[PDB]
Enzyme design. Structure first.
Site, PDB file in Angstrom:
ATOM      1  N   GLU A 253       0.819  -1.225   0.000  1.00 13.04           N
ATOM      2  CA  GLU A 253       0.000   0.000   0.000  1.00 13.04           C
ATOM      3  C   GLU A 253       0.848   1.268   0.000  1.00 13.04           C
ATOM      4  OE1 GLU A 253      -2.999   0.294  -0.587  1.00 13.04           O
ATOM      5  OE2 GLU A 253      -3.959  -1.661  -0.069  1.00 13.04           O
TER       6      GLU A 253
ATOM      7  N   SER B 204     -11.786  10.868  -3.649  1.00 10.86           N
ATOM      8  CA  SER B 204     -11.308  10.558  -2.282  1.00 10.86           C
ATOM      9  C   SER B 204      -9.727  10.390  -2.308  1.00 10.86           C
ATOM     10  CB  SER B 204     -11.895   9.241  -1.742  1.00 10.86           C
ATOM     11  OG  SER B 204     -11.582   8.110  -2.568  1.00 10.86           O
TER      12      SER B 204
ATOM     13  N   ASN C 265      -7.687   9.007  -5.356  1.00  9.96           N
ATOM     14  CA  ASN C 265      -8.485   8.078  -6.136  1.00  9.96           C
ATOM     15  C   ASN C 265      -9.269   8.795  -7.234  1.00  9.96           C
ATOM     16  OD1 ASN C 265      -9.074   6.793  -2.824  1.00  9.96           O
ATOM     17  ND2 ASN C 265      -7.716   5.901  -4.380  1.00  9.96           N
TER      18      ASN C 265
ATOM     19  N   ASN D 177      -8.869   5.178   3.301  1.00  6.76           N
ATOM     20  CA  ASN D 177      -9.591   6.057   2.320  1.00  6.76           C
ATOM     21  C   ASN D 177     -10.518   7.060   3.004  1.00  6.76           C
ATOM     22  OD1 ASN D 177     -11.133   6.959   0.047  1.00  6.76           O
ATOM     23  ND2 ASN D 177     -11.334   4.903  -0.885  1.00  6.76           N
TER      24      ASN D 177
ATOM     25  N   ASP E 127      -6.343   8.248  -0.298  1.00  9.65           N
ATOM     26  CA  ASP E 127      -5.878   7.226   0.629  1.00  9.65           C
ATOM     27  C   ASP E 127      -4.612   7.737   1.403  1.00  9.65           C
ATOM     28  OD1 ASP E 127      -7.775   5.473  -0.466  1.00  9.65           O
ATOM     29  OD2 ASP E 127      -6.269   4.288  -1.504  1.00  9.65           O
TER      30      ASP E 127
ATOM     31  N   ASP F  58     -12.260   8.857  -7.994  1.00 11.17           N
ATOM     32  CA  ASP F  58     -13.515   9.428  -7.485  1.00 11.17           C
ATOM     33  C   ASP F  58     -13.437  10.662  -6.603  1.00 11.17           C
ATOM     34  OD1 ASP F  58     -12.635   8.412  -4.901  1.00 11.17           O
ATOM     35  OD2 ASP F  58     -14.236   7.059  -4.727  1.00 11.17           O
TER      36      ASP F  58
HETATM   37 CL   LIG Z   1      -9.702  13.642  -0.941  1.00  8.35          CL
END
Ligand SMILES: [Cl-]
Ligand SMILES: [Cl-]
Ligand SMILES: [Cl-]
Ligand SMILES: [Cl-]
Ligand SMILES: [Cl-]
Ligand SMILES: [Cl-]
Ligand SMILES: [Cl-]
Ligand SMILES: [Cl-]
Length: 129
Positions: free
Chosen positions: A35, A50, A46, A59, A52, A48
């Site tokens: 990760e 968001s 991401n 997330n 991480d 979308d």
């Molecule tokens: Cl964000």
């Protein structure tokens, strides 16, 4: 902070992640390797919108607040920045909530794709734990 492999194993054990929910320490080290490459400061956006955060790439869509992920929740009740600290307490506490959420470590798609089913004990091999 960039941890060494055994150094992170020891820190995860110290914070009770060892065998948490039945997942051995090698599973958690393996997840962290793929990760974040053991870097507490890792962040990744991401598609979308968001992001991480941290050693386990938690997330902002569900788990932490970053102020910029509309419609998202903050189930760990933490600022996402807290997940970037040298001290891994906030990331371990939140990971414990995530892995208890119903799909175990499949929540980490790098764990499912790179760790699951493999010889994860190799990640703690040689470590004084
Ligand atoms: Cl964000
Ligand atoms: Cl390594
Ligand atoms: Cl293991
Ligand atoms: Cl982190
Ligand atoms: Cl937000
Ligand atoms: Cl919102
Ligand atoms: Cl720590
Ligand atoms: Cl992956």
């Amino acid at each position: 902070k960039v941890f060494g492999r055994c150094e992170l194993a020891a820190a995860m054990k110290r914070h009770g992640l060892d065998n948490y929910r039945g997942y051995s320490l090698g599973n958690w080290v393996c997840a962290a390797k793929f990760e974040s490459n053991f870097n507490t400061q890792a962040t990744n956006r991401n598609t979308d919108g968001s992001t991480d955060y941290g050693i386990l790439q938690i997330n902002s869509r569900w788990w932490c607040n970053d102020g910029r992920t509309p419609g998202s929740r903050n189930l760990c009740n933490i600022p996402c920045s807290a997940l970037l600290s040298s001290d891994i307490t906030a990331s371990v506490n939140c990971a414990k909530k995530i892995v208890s959420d119903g799909n175990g470590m499949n929540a980490w798609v790098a764990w499912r794709n790179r760790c699951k089913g493999t010889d994860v004990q190799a990640w703690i091999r040689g470590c004084r734990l």
